[PDB]
Amino acid sequence: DGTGISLHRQLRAIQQLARNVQAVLGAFERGTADQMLHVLLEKAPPLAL
Amino acid sequence: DVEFDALLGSYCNTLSLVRFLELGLSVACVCTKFPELAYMNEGRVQFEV
Secondary structure (H helix, E strand, O other): OOOHHHHHHHHHHHHHHHHHHHHHHHHHHHHHHHHHHHHHHHHOOOOOO | OOOOOOOOOOOOOOOOOOOOOOOOHHHHOOOOOOHHHHOOOOOOOOOOO
């Protein structure tokens, strides 16, 4: 509506968006490393054996 | 015999626009524009006598 109220809470929106997008992209950098050890775990046989 | 039928005129009016401000009612009210009435919750005026 043009009122400053709409401005600030829009910042909060742009803010929260940037924070989740930031969070899910890094989920693939950890996903990978986790993906590894598990794929490393699926593949891996114990030492004892 | 030569005949015709004619449109002898076309009339329109003017829709007239009144302003609350050119009125005497406007003395019975203080008017202010408050674009955030949407975002308000409870407004209050308080008096002392």
